Structure 1
Amino acid sequence: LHALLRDIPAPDAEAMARTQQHIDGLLKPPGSLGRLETLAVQLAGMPGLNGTPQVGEKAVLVMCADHGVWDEGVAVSPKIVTAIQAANMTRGTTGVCVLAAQAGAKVHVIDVGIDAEPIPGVVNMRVARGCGNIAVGPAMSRLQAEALLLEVSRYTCDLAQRGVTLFGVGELGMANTTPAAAMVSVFTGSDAKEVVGIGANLPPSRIDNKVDVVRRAIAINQPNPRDGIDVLSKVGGFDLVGMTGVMLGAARCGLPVLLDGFLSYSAALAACQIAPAVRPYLIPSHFSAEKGARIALAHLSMEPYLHMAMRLGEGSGAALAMPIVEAACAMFHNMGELAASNIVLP
C-alpha cells in the first residue's frame, strides 16, 4: 500500500505543453473553447493516455454496501433496497445502467459489504455484512480499510490492461449520506449542520436527528483529519472506502477518474488527503443537489461541468459526463487548423 501510493506518477508536463500548442492552433479563437481545452490538456498529462487526449473503453465501478448507522433512523429507504438495487444493476434497468449504456461504458457492480446473501453476477469483495454503526463506534478496523483499498486499487488498474482508459466511480448504500457528511465535516472543518443534507428524500423533520448522529459519530470516534485512512475506517463505510480505492488505483495507473455526486466528493477528499498526487487525475462531473456539495467541492477546488440538480448516486452523473470527456478528445483530434486556412489573428 505504501508502495502503491509511492508509485503514483506525476503529470507529463511535456505532453501537456505540446497539447496546449496544438489546441491554440486550432480553427478557432485561442481559448474560445474554454474548459474543453483545459480538460484536453489535463488528459494529455496523464501517462496512461500516452501523451494525448484519448478515450478507449469506459467503465463505471459501483461500490455497494450497507451501513450500521441505518438503525439510527437517518434513512427513509428500506435497508433491503441496497441488495435489491445491486441485483437490478446486473439487469441494466437502473439509472446508472441506462446512462452508462448511452455513453457506451460498462458498469461493474462490486459488493464490498452488502448485508444480505451474495448476489450472482456481482463482483464479490465483501468485507462484512454491513459496516459498524458509526454512531457508537468505528465502521471498521484500519486493517479492513487498508485491505479493501489495496484490493479495489488492483482491480481497477487491472481493468486498464483490458483497454479501459476512463473510469467512473459510483456507490449504492442506504444511509450512506450520513457517513459521507461526517467525513466532509471532519476533512473540511465545517459544522455538521452545514453539511448534512436530505439524502434520499429524508423528511425535513428528521434532519435534526441526522445532524445529531453525525456529531456523535465524530465525538465518539475522534477521527484524525490529517489521516484519511483513519477517517474512512472510523466514520466512513465500505462503499466509501471502495470509491477511494478506485481513485488511488486509477491514479497509480496514470488514468482519469470521473467523480459522481456528494458521496464521491467525500471519497475524493479522503483520497487527496491520503495521496495528494491523486488530485491531477480527478475529473468532476456534476454538481450534486446535496446540501454539503458546495463546501466539499470548494475544498477539492473543483467546478463541476454539469448542473442537473441530480442526487441519485450510482455513478449516474459520472456516466452523464463521459460524452464531455470524449468531446474534448474529438475537438483535439478532428478540428482543422488556422494556418491551413490562412487565418491570422493578433
Structure 2
Amino acid sequence: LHALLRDIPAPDAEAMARTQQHIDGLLKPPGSLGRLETLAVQLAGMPGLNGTPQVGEKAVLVMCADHGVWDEGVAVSPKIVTAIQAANMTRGTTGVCVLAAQAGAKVHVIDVGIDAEPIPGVVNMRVARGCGNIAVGPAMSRLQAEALLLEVSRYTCDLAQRGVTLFGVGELGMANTTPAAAMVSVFTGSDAKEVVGIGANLPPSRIDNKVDVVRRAIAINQPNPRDGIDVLSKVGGFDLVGMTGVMLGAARCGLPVLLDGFLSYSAALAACQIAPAVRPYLIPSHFSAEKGARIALAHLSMEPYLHMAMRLGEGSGAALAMPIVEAACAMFHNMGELAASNIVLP
C-alpha cells in the first residue's frame, strides 16, 4: 500500500503541451471550445492513455454496503433496499444500469459489506455484514480499511488490463449520506448543519436528529483530518472506502475517474488527503443536489459540467458524463485545422 501510493505517476507535461498546440490549430477560434479543450489536455496528460485523449472501454464500479448508523433513524429507506437494489444491478433495471448502457459502459457491482446473504452475480469483497454504527464507535478497524483499499485498488487496475480506459465510481448503501456528511465536515472543517442534507427524501423534521448523529460520530471518534485512512475507518463506511480504492487504483494505473455525487465527493476528499497525486486523475460529472455539495466541491476545487439537480447516486451522474469525455476526444481527433483552410487569425 505504501508501494501503491508511491508508484502513482505524475501527469505527462510533454504530452499535454503537444495536446494544447494541436487543439489550438483546430477549426475554431482559439479557446472557443472552453472546458472541452481543457478536459482534452487533461486526458492527454494521463499515462495510461498513451499521450492522447482517448477512450477505450468504460466501466462503472458500484460499491455496495450497509451501515450501522441506520439504526439511529437517519434514513427513511428500508435497510433491505441495499440488498434488493444490488440484485437489481445484476438485472440491468437500475438507474445507473440504464444510463451506463446508454453510454456503452459496463457496470461492476461490488459487495463490500451488504448486511444480507451473498447475492449471486455480485462481486464479493464483503468486509462484514454492514459497518459499525459510527454514532457510538468506529465504522471499522484501520486494518480493515487498508485491506479493502488494497483489494479494490488492485481490482480496478486489473480491469485496465482488459481494455478499460475510463472509470466511473458509484455507491449503494441505505443511510450513507450520514457518514458522507461526517467526512465532509471533518475534512473541510465545516459545521455539521452546513453539510447535512435530506439524503433520500428524509423528512424536514428528522434533519435535526441527523445533524446530532453526525456531531456525535465526530465527538466520539475524534478522527484525524490529516489522516484520510483514519477518517474513513472511523466515520466512513465500506462503500466509502471502496470508492476511495477505485480512485487510488485508477490513479496508480494512470487512468481517469469520473466522480458521481455527494458520496463520491467525500471519498474523493479522503483520496486526495491520502495521496494528493490522485487529484489530476479525477474528473467531476454533475453538481449534486445534496446540501453539502458546494462545500465539498470547493474543497476539491472542482466545477462539474452537468447541472441536473440529481441525487440518486449509484454512479448515475458518472455514466451521464461519459459522453462528454468521448466528445472531447472526438473533437481532438476529428476536427479539421485552420491552416488547411488557409484561415488566418490574429
TM-score of the aligned structures, taking structure 1 as reference length: 1.00
Question: How far is 1:194 from its partner?
Answer: 0.0
Question: How far is 1:197 from its partner?
Answer: 0.1
Question: How far is 1:232 from its partner?
Answer: 0.1
Distance in 1 between residues matched to 2:241 and 2:288, nearest whole Å: 20
Distance in 2 between residues matched to 1:166 and 1:30, nearest whole Å: 27
In structure 2, the partner of 1:325 is 325
Distance in 2 between residues matched to 1:248 and 1:112, nearest whole Å: 16
Question: How far is 1:60 from its partner?
Answer: 0.1
Question: How far is 1:309 from its partner?
Answer: 0.1
Look up the SS of the partner of 1:205 in the other structure.
coil
Question: How far is 1:190 from its partner?
Answer: 0.2
Distance in 1 between residues matched to 2:143 and 2:168, nearest whole Å: 26
Distance in 1 between residues matched to 2:340 and 2:8, nearest whole Å: 40
Write out per-residue CA displacement over residues 312-341 of structure 1, whole angstroms, 9 at most, x where no aligned residue: 000000000000000000000000000000
Question: How far is 1:277 from its partner?
Answer: 0.1
Question: How far is 1:17 from its partner?
Answer: 0.1
Distance in 1 between residues matched to 2:25 and 2:64, nearest whole Å: 45
In structure 2, the partner of 1:99 is 99
In structure 2, the partner of 1:226 is 226
In structure 1, the partner of 2:149 is 149
In structure 2, the partner of 1:308 is 308
Distance in 2 between residues matched to 1:162 and 1:8, nearest whole Å: 20
Distance in 1 between residues matched to 2:211 and 2:2, nearest whole Å: 35
Question: How far is 1:152 from its partner?
Answer: 0.1
Write out per-residue CA displacement over residues 68-119 of structure 1, whole angstroms, 9 at most, x where no aligned residue: 0000000000000000000000000000000000000000000000000000
Question: How far is 1:276 from its partner?
Answer: 0.1
Distance in 2 between residues matched to 1:201 and 1:125, nearest whole Å: 29
> What is the CA RMSD across the aligned residues, in angstroms?
0.1
Write out per-residue CA displacement over residues 185-233 of structure 1, whole angstroms, 9 at most, x where no aligned residue: 0000000000000000000000000000000000000000000000000
Q: Which runs of 5+ in 2 are unaligned?
A: none
Question: How far is 1:45 from its partner?
Answer: 0.1
Distance in 2 between residues matched to 1:132 and 1:317, nearest whole Å: 28
Look up the SS of the partner of 2:109 in the other structure.
strand
Question: How far is 1:50 from its partner?
Answer: 0.2
Write out per-residue CA displacement over residues 143-193 of structure 1, whole angstroms, 9 at most, x where no aligned residue: 000000000000000000000000000000000000000000000000000
Question: How far is 1:36 from its partner?
Answer: 0.0
Look up the SS of the partner of 2:205 in the other structure.
helix
Question: How far is 1:13 from its partner?
Answer: 0.1
Look up the SS of the partner of 1:151 in the other structure.
helix
TM-score of the aligned structures, taking structure 2 as reference length: 1.00
Question: How far is 1:30 from its partner?
Answer: 0.2
The total of aligned residue pairs comes to 346
* Match runs of 1:1-346 below 5 Å: 1-346=1-346
- Identical positions, percent: 100
Question: How far is 1:265 from its partner?
Answer: 0.1
Distance in 2 between residues matched to 1:161 and 1:82, nearest whole Å: 30
Q: Which runs of 5+ in 1 are unaligned?
A: none
